[PDB]
Design a protein around this ligand. Structure first.
Ligand SMILES: C[N@+]1(C[C@H](O)c2ccccc2)[C@@H]2CC[C@H]1C[C@@H](OC(=O)c1ccccc1)C2
Ligand SMILES: C[N@+]1(C[C@H](O)c2ccccc2)[C@@H]2CC[C@H]1C[C@@H](OC(=O)c1ccccc1)C2
Ligand SMILES: C[N@+]1(C[C@H](O)c2ccccc2)[C@@H]2CC[C@H]1C[C@@H](OC(=O)c1ccccc1)C2
Ligand SMILES: C[N@+]1(C[C@H](O)c2ccccc2)[C@@H]2CC[C@H]1C[C@@H](OC(=O)c1ccccc1)C2
Ligand SMILES: C[N@+]1(C[C@H](O)c2ccccc2)[C@@H]2CC[C@H]1C[C@@H](OC(=O)c1ccccc1)C2
Ligand SMILES: [Cl-]
Ligand SMILES: [Cl-]
Ligand SMILES: [Cl-]
Ligand SMILES: [Cl-]
Ligand SMILES: [Cl-]
Ligand SMILES: [Cl-]
Lengths: 205, 205, 205, 205, 205
């Protein structure tokens, strides 16, 4: 359709790209995790591998449009390259995250963007006692690597991690999986930094 | 040489790229698998490695042309970068898919496109009992990561996976291989998401 | 160096790139293998690792020039990116080929191009009996992934693989190595596809 | 905000990029290490893997501005690609460094730049005696690969490595971690080269 | 700085890039190796891993300048991408070379260029007898992949490999390390190909 072709150029090729949030014009990114599998556990390096998808959501006034002015188009899909995306990083990874999904995001007329990156992550986790009935607990923090609390804010729609798509025949059972917002102060910086703490209690099936 | 150079310019450099399907202008992608080998089976992580090529076909009105107006050219080969391609993704992969073939597609005057990506896939599968006479059964779903059934529809020309090119001296005998269209409903969204379920039954040779 | 700078500009920057062969403009690519080493044999996955270089050769009328019109220059070296190159692919690889040589080709005034890519290949090969006196035999087909026989034809200057540069202290002895042209018919396509079959009989040193 | 979009334009797109330091216009880069984990130790190759983040800091006159002239903007985040960055390299690495953080730096109105790359490093370290109560000591030098002392100078805000974020359940305890500036002389060059020596004494739990 | 920025524009953005050497305008590249460590020895595949840096040196008339006309600037550092670099390749590698240093070269007013790439190399080497007092000897040839002797010539400033920076606590002692120039003849070509043979005799510590 000719209508959608016009909207994409009337937004991206017509205006310069979003320079990211500022202290004056902050941004709130809504985070959410859907855990798929605990693939590997390396007891000799205390490295644990997770397969999950991360639901990222934010709103930009620069991405708004009137659907009536563009042939009643409410939303559209686009390459994550064509738009600004938050630098949400795992604070205890041991190897670069592996992307398992297409780099496509969906933009809506109200300016809200949704990005659902699937990934394989290796993080610092001591699995001592995973073989027990009680199980072992491990956590990993996610947040911006460069933006403070005054620039990028985080939130979760639920504190419960989505386990509805967890791999039934995994070598590891999930006992609990939690996503909790945290406000931390680091020596580096006078301003606070926000993260979402992914905490999973698991055991050998 | 000169006629083909002109056609490619008029199709890609003159008109804007296809913005993908919409609910109003959907698309049907025909899927098909040609299984080559079951390379590896990791019983400690329940990860199984597949080598296959998936034939994907779709038709675009934006890609039509009159062969008489372009020196009786009926079709041509082009980089998969020069054209829109469907985001068909494996829903239970454990590592990024490895591409084993050139990223070239073949376009025909009727607007039909054919892309046959060869790849190595590691997916979640419990291989317990592969050592038996009966063998073990495993499945993996393929479908769009961002487009719903209202935007991208999937179909198969047959429900029989092409095993004509399966590696005769593989460590694993293929007992059966099936490709079935399935329509799923996810908690995530209020529209159905459709996929192609690849179901293999195999055993040790 | 001024003469060569003019020639390279007048060929590539003056004319649009070669859109690849067609049935009206066919092409014959001469193939040849120089086997260097059989590095690894994985009996649990039936994957064998080769190190070789393949000599690719073709001729383009679009790449012809008068040496007298360009300061008696008969030939020149150029990046494989600056020119069209055939999509010669291994039909039974298990992992993406690893390039071990620079991506440079040599162009001659008659329009003939020579490209000698060195590479490490992992392909489907059952090594059962490599430990015997008789040894084990394995094969791998090479050919275009998208072009038929009426677009790209293949030929060999000899059926005998160059073993003159094979690694003397390899863990595996080559008993024989053959390169044979094959014309194959696939259901997919009304035209015959053509390839070069690399067959190597080898054993433990 | 357009105020920032105009500043990024007037800095980078208006002026040519910084050609790096010279003997006439030198630069001092402030270095600092935050050690996160000692992931593994390979006693058969004497290779040790570290996870840490490097804090890089320098000031450019070409990057300073009056905040009042650009809507009271004191600082901003930007891709490490659109700015010059020092070539600080590990002098005893055994494999290419793996980047674990986004390639974003923060520029301030005074022309001071801060870059905090997180990374996984494999370096030459003999772990003989890591099993003892005394532990083992290892070091790695960091510095410019091309710029000398007269071009790039290095300094540390402290000689103590930040261990505040070290992984509590690591297989290895840190006994001490030091960052010391060194001025060395190499045969290659008549001018002194300067580096920061990362020295860590550790032991297995 | 205003002065260096102008020279970098007048050198690269003014004139077209160097099309490489020809038979009429040859080039002599001076090679030199600084061996850092023998990391690994794989007796089951006869693959040995080296960590070293390779000093490359050549002179181009196209890169000459009058320092007085450019604010008494004698030399400058630049990306290896901005300039032509020789295709010096290891003739017996088993995996792609891993770069361990920044891709920056230093250009001098006389047109002489220096490039010092650090790298990790896996090459064909039978380590049988490394455990003995006598040790084992291994070699690897380095040279152009496309240019003959009549186009690129190689030379060494010394036949002795720099062992001054060899890793003190390496699992392997160097008994001798030699960098000798060789002129050979291959079947492929009527012109002689020239190379530098890196020969290292080593044993277990
Ligand atoms: C969350 N951070 C990492 C944090 O220190 C950390 C590191 C490892 C484990 C747990 C937390 C904090 C802040 C961002 C990110 C990287 C570090 O970043 C910084 O040091 C910083 C960031 C911006 C400007 C100046 C300095 C520290
Ligand atoms: C099928 N999906 C993956 C799902 O997690 C899954 C995993 C394993 C087996 C079967 C389905 C479901 C739906 C499409 C695809 C990607 C995910 O996509 C989404 O959740 C989504 C996509 C677009 C807009 C808003 C949300 C979840
Ligand atoms: C030679 N081909 C691959 C070969 O048959 C093969 C078979 C099994 C596994 C791996 C390679 C054949 C033909 C080209 C190439 C890729 C495949 O291509 C096709 O099926 C095809 C090609 C062009 C248009 C429409 C369909 C099969
Ligand atoms: C520290 N360097 C390496 C050094 O030789 C070394 C190597 C291994 C271990 C420890 C130090 C020194 C100086 C920078 C870096 C690379 C080498 O660089 C050079 O030899 C050089 C640099 C610029 C112009 C001409 C030559 C030597
Ligand atoms: C040294 N070469 C490889 C050589 O055959 C070899 C291969 C393995 C081990 C030792 C030497 C020789 C020459 C360069 C390089 C690549 C090969 O290159 C060629 O065959 C060639 C080069 C230019 C024009 C036409 C053909 C052969
Ligand atoms: Cl693994
Ligand atoms: Cl590992
Ligand atoms: Cl493997
Ligand atoms: Cl290996
Ligand atoms: Cl390793
Ligand atoms: Cl040998």
């Amino acid at each position: 359709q000719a209508n959608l072709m016009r909207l994409k150029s009337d937004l991206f090729n017509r205006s310069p790209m979003y320079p990211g949030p500022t202290k004056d014009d902050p941004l709130t990114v809504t985070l959410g995790f859907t855990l798929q599998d605990i693939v590997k556990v390396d007891s000799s390096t205390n490295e644990v591998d997770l397969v999950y998808y991360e639901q990222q959501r934010w709103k930009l006034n620069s991405l708004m449009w009137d659907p009536n002015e563009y042939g009643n188009i409410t939303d559209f899909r686009t390459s994550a390259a064509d738009i600004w995306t938050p630098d949400i990083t795992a604070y205890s990874s041991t190897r670069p995250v592996q992307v398992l999904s297409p780099q496509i995001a969906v933009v809506t007329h109200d300016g809200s963007v949704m990005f659902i990156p699937a990934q394989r992550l290796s993080f610092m986790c001591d699995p001592t006692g995973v073989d027990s009935e009680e199980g072992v607990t491990c956590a990993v923090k996610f947040g911006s690597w460069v933006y403070s609390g005054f620039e990028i804010d985080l939130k979760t729609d639920t504190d419960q991690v989505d386990l509805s798509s967890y791999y039934a025949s995994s070598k590891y059972e999930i006992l609990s999986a939690t996503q909790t917002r945290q406000v931390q102060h680091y020596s580096c910086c006078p301003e606070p930094y926000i993260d979402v703490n992914l905490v999973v209690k698991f055991r050998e099936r």
